[PDB]
Design a protein that fits this description.
The complex is a hetero-oligomer of 30 chains, with twelve copies of chain A (63 residues) and 18 copies of chain B. Chain A is mainly β. Chain A has a single domain, classed as TRAP-like (Immunoglobulin-like, Sandwich), CATH 2.60.40. Chain A is built from no helices and six strands. In chain A, 56% of the residues are buried. Chain B has one domain: Chaperone, DNAj Protein, Chain A (Other non-globular). In chain B, 31% of the residues lie in helices and 10% in strands. Chain B contains one helix and two strands. The chains are: A mainly beta (63), B alpha+beta (42). The interface between D and G is medium-sized, with 15 and 13 residues. The structure holds tryptophan (12 copies) and zinc ion (ZN) (6 copies). One zinc ion (ZN) binds next to loops of chain D. It is classed as rna binding protein/transcription. Keywords: protein-protein complex, transcription, RNA-binding, Transcription regulation, RNA binding protein-transcription complex.
């Protein structure tokens, strides 16, 4: 069970969730204005996170 | 990117059906905008 | 079962829980006034935590 | 005041799917009271 | 199963337990007067612990 | 923030019913306080 | 209840609008919350 | 602009088995629009 | 399963066990007079330990 | 003495849901005696 | 599977075993005279060890 | 399950997903413009990730 | 503490029953001492 | 009765059934 | 039609069914 | 499956095995004369080892 | 003497539930001989 | 499930996948031009990866 | 499954195996003359190893 | 070493059949090249 | 301490029976030594 | 057996009490052990 | 030459059970071609 | 699932795969010309890898 | 195919032995491989 | 499962395998002349290895 | 799942595989001429490897 | 020689339960030959 | 050692049976050498 | 018979069946 930490470093940062399955779409996009944090798990329905705009990211790997 | 699935649909708050007309699901304004555009020009 | 530690560093800090599943909504938001701690697990119904306002955050991934 | 307004509700950060048209998402304290009142009114 | 250590550093420290499930309420609040310790597991019924008032907290992550 | 469910109830020690009046489910003083207030003003 | 309801000082009525009892801030807070969310 | 041609398609690095003759591979944004249009047209 | 070590540093130290389940009561309280040790597991029936009075505590986390 | 009042009972830190109106919570030594007496009385 | 090491540092040291289950009694008390060692597992029937009198204790934690 | 972190260091970076199964095609290609991050899991449908263009990559192995 | 369950009972060595009279189980001297005391004064 | 006597008896009477 | 208009329409027409 | 190492440092050292179950008896005692080693596992039937007389003891927990 | 008394038996450290009224708890060497004798006598 | 990182250090680097099973063939060959990365899992259908041409390789073992 | 290393440091070293089960007997004794090694697993039938006479012993714990 | 199965075939986009002639199974140009050569000389 | 079960028996190589006389179960010399001694004196 | 039983030196009888053979310490050790625990 | 002989076959290191009397054990490249030819000839 | 890394250091290096089962044959031999890498898993059908000719080898055990 | 077959320069026949087309080294390589292993 | 490495340091080194089960016999003895290595697993049928004669031994524990 | 690395240091090195089961025979012997490597797993059918002749051996243990 | 007496048998370190009266324990090479002969004789 | 099971037998390439005569399995030259030797002298 | 001959034969005869 893995998760990503996203801290918005500027306004209007986008976290877009891509769909698990044969076909791939943007199922949900979350918005982060400067200084807001989103902690997001890879899930049954979500197998790719896309981060748009300057932001600080923490993963199971490093920084 | 700037448009998500959420920006197009929404699960009919009733049928988690007359409200969505069996679509299960209601279109947003952005939804129609694109669909009307495509249907008129396809 | 993973969890996040959130300590409010200012008043009115918000912890918003996003729903696990095909569609994603804010199903619960908790309020933290300066110095209040919330320890929150990712759960069957919650797969994304959103933190609004100045706060100290501890995860498995780090601070 | 013992319980506030802030304790109970929260302004929706997006506005709506996020709040389901409610515009206010509730705290745990909020539901506690509401569930208790609804169950016994 | 994970647990949290809470040591009250002042009088009237509150440990409130939030309900596991679709909806979230304060199901129980424990009282800690200065120097009292509560060791609490996250449980079938409890998936969020909230700490009100000055207290020392130990988790799997840190302090 | 200072008021839990435990503070508004209490499981009837008899049925885990005349004691709770089917309620299962003895309300606290705090419980009625809120309830009476809301019912009188709603 | 005291922390919510107070005796209308006039009718121990226009002042209370017939309720027999006014309301504190904490009173409204709860009442507005429940009225907006009930049912 | 908001969404360019590049955002939707993307060409085939190889050309075709890789793209199955389509001549282009779609982005997530691409599918998103296409799935929405096909389901409601 | 996990366990807590409690060594009483003064007379009349209380270890109170809270019940696992929807509702939470003090189901058992053990007494520890200065220098007495209790080693206690979190159990099917017990999901929170409360320590009253000056005592030394060892858990999986620390001290 | 061998077994005082303190060894058997112990008061309720809260007072009541915590002790279920009993006014006191029992030690292990308490149950031990009580279970033995109740089973053989 | 956990166990406690108890070494009696004086005569008449008591290791009392408390019962796993809804109710809690002293099911068995072992006696340790100075220098005698008892190695005891938490078991199906035993979920709390109580140590009376000066003794050296080794646990999964520390000393 | 495992995941790859891809940060685009230039404009027009391509992340192409190859299909799990007897035959292998490019089923989806994502676009990353300088400074955009994609966190991607190996999935039921995806068993090879191909990265085109200057980018920073984090995996279980390293960099 | 100084008294344990062991100090009160003992599993009938026969029925791991005439020996224990269906009690399954024989009382120790300390057992009777307490029980006789309680029954005479209750 | 001794003090120890009452201690036991008071405990039992207060909690029996 | 705007450039953004064609962009969408060309994309849809090339890939539909 | 855990085990204890017992090396007798004097003559007549006793290793007593206590029974796993609701009731606890000495079901077997082994004798160790100076310099004799017994390596003993906690078993289905044995859940407590008691060591009498001067002896060197090695456990998972230590010496 | 090849086998002793100490080898075979052990004085009960408690006295009785611990020895089950036997007063002597036996070593492995003890049972070895006893089981062999009992089985073939 | 294990994976290999392949970074092409020259033009025309080949990653060939060998078939899992009784018989072994080249079922697919991927092309990597200088600076292109392929992250490839060993799969139900693929149990040997062959790398042709100058390339940087990262595995669970080393490089 | 755990094992013990026994190296005989003198002539006539004995490794005796005790029986797993309700009752405990010497089921087998192995003979080790100076410099002979026996590597022995604890088994379905053997749950205690006894070493008689000067010998070097290696276990999961130490020596 | 430079010639895989993917290089000699291609799954028929129609049947995962007239398109592949039952072959399932469109042969590449490279495929026929080898095949024609071997059949002509075997 | 110096006498195991292996030292008092031996599984009959025939039945894992005339060879062991149902005993399954050949007794060693050491075995009879003890047995004869105990039977003669018991 | 020699390490247990010895020939009564008198009847090769009060000395052996009719057993025909006396007993060593090791003899008694085993016999006392078995008699106290048998059946 | 694009594909060699070495690419395709290999001299048996033992000679035979190892090669099953074939004397030449084949590379992956070898089978690739052979399976393709056999399936379509 | 373990694997071996083989890098050919000279031309004509051979990787021979031996069959899992009661009887053992060379079922496949792969050829590696100087600088070519083969990453090979031990599989259902292959339980021994034989390397002929000068080559660099990486295993879980080492080089 | 060019990398295998070439036009017999004589019959665009003893030179090609009636095949109509000779063979390159790469040609034989494949042909010898398939002939030795087919069926 | 576990294994022992035996390198014979002299001629005529014996590795004897004892049988798993209620009764214990020497079921197989292997011969190692100076410099020969035997790597031997504890098996369904073998639960004790005996080494006779000067030899170097590697186990999970040490040397 | 364990394996042995054998590198032949001289010509004619033999790796002999012994059979798993009640009886033990040489089921397969592999030959290694100087510089040839065999990586061999202990398998369903093979539970003892025997190495004849000067060779370098790498095991789960050491060298 | 190729295979000596030592390579096939080997004596019994104890002598007999250990060798089951055979007087010798067999090497792997021993079984190998014996199993082959017994199966085909 | 110098002789293995492989040096004695070989799984009949046909019955993974006339080829092996139900032996499942063909003897090598080394196989016969030993067997002929033993049968002639046993 | 050679020494190697007897070696084999003695081994087989001593262990057969
Ligand atoms: N299920 C995802 C798989 C995926 C995750 N991350 C990826 C990155 C690239 C390609 C595919 C993926 C999809 O529809 O595509
Ligand atoms: N897709 C997840 C839940 C989810 C929805 N939106 C998300 C956004 C981020 C992370 C997770 C989610 C599931 O169904 O299990
Ligand atoms: N989902 C939890 C509540 C919860 C967990 N994490 C959260 C973060 C924010 C808000 C609520 C939560 C429940 O079962 O009720
Ligand atoms: N049933 C749980 C409830 C609980 C867990 N953690 C808590 C913290 C505070 C209040 C209640 C809880 C218990 O008794 O442990
Ligand atoms: N089963 C035990 C639970 C327990 C173990 N340790 C404890 C410490 C305190 C309270 C309860 C416990 C009981 O009857 O109570
Ligand atoms: N089905 C697998 C095939 C594969 C795995 N690794 C490879 C390496 C090269 C070529 C193909 C593969 C995939 O798409 O990932
Ligand atoms: N209670 C344990 C065994 C046991 C009895 N008395 C004990 C004393 C200490 C440790 C364990 C025990 C069981 O039934 O499984
Ligand atoms: N056995 C693998 C191929 C293989 C794995 N390791 C090898 C080493 C050498 C040769 C072939 C292999 C398969 O399934 O096809
Ligand atoms: N219980 C073990 C014997 C045993 C294990 N540990 C012990 C310690 C002391 C005495 C006996 C034992 C058996 O099965 O027979
Ligand atoms: N015996 C293994 C495979 C095998 C055959 N010969 C071997 C030589 C070495 C290692 C493994 C093997 C099995 O059946 O699963
Ligand atoms: N069946 C077991 C018996 C055993 C294990 N360890 C022992 C030590 C000594 C004597 C016998 C044993 C074996 O052959 O291994
Ligand atoms: N199955 C093997 C067991 C074994 C592995 N290594 C050993 C070493 C010595 C004796 C036996 C073994 C056998 O037939 O014997
Ligand atoms: Zn909203
Ligand atoms: Zn009024
Ligand atoms: Zn006793
Ligand atoms: Zn006489
Ligand atoms: Zn061959
Ligand atoms: Zn011609």
């Amino acid at each position: 069970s893995d998760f990503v930490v996203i801290k918005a470093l500027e306004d209007g940062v986008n976290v877009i969730g891509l769909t698990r399955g044969a076909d791939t779409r943007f199922h949900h996009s979350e918005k982060l204005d400067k200084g807001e944090v989103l902690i997001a798990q890879f899930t049954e329905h979500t197998s790719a996170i896309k981060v748009r705009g300057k932001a600080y990211i923490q993963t199971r790997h490093g920084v | 990117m700037v448009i998500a699935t959420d920006d197009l649909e929404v699960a009919c708050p009733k049928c988690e059906c007359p409200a969505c007309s069996g679509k299960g699901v209601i279109l947003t304004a952005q939804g129609y905008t694109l669909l009307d555009f495509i249907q008129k020009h396809l």
